[PDB]
Design a protein around this ligand. Sequence first.
Ligand SMILES: O=C1NCCCCn2cc(cn2)-c2cnc3ccc(cc3c2)CCn2nc(ccc2=O)-c2ccc1c(C(F)(F)F)c2
Length: 285
Amino acid sequence: PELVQAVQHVVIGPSSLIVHFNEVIGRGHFGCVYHGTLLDNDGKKIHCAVKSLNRITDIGEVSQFLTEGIIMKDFSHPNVLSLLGICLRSEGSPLVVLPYMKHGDLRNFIRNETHNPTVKDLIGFGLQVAKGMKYLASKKFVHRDLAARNCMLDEKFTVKVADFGLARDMYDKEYYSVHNKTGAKLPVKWMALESLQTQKFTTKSDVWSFGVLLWELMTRGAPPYPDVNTFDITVYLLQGRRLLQPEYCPDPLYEVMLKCWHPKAEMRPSFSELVSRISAIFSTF
Ligand SMILES: O=C1NCCCCn2cc(cn2)-c2cnc3ccc(cc3c2)CCn2nc(ccc2=O)-c2ccc1c(C(F)(F)F)c2
């Protein structure tokens, strides 16, 4: 009922969606994530994940969020989370329907002590993330929050770059600082040096975050900079100090992470260059 209703291409009838409100699989600031059952266009069942935006209650603030995230329906890539559609009911907020990911976020899956991913598995995950970011970079899309907690893992061990568009939220409050006066949500220990100083974000700052994601993988979910507080993080980086090399990180892989953290954003590699270099490491040893 507001302006551009070209959302009809992705509208789901409420009678074609069942939301299992008893099963929470994720808690964001805008709303929770639930299990769901969706009747496809061909009439078959599928698992799905429903994201509620119940906590943002303002017709203008909601219309701004929907127009910002509706771009994700046009993206198509095996390493990027797709949109199944949105369901609008007369009992409030809109619901975002997304494909179900059997293993949840990437970081929780590798932190789990009952899982045995090999060193080749972890390198392969990072390669899948680089391929997803290469797609988003060619479409001129800056993510702003790339981390292991924001990447999903489906049944076939496929990694989906997530937490963007209509799925953007804070899913783990511990690692974010809420800015006074702008209200921006800043993941301090994942941000490029130039982003901590100006609060601007580019694809080159996405590359910095990607290097931190690689460090996350080779440590199987360790928290970055455990001995540096959120104030000293900027002087620590200005001194040229960086994250140390994990015990079981091959040397060429640590060099790729050091290339991602160069002081000049320009001097950093592109995601296309990262796809070439990581694949080579994967195919040998
Ligand atoms: O609590 C979390 N995991 C604790 C143990 C996992 C339990 N579990 C979760 C599912 C199945 N089991 C699950 C299955 N399919 C999904 C399909 C789409 C979506 C979420 C889905 C979640 C879109 C929403 N979205 N969510 C996240 C990241 C990006 C994103 O876009 C995100 C979800 C959960 C959690 C976290 C974090 F680790 F950060 F904290 C983060």
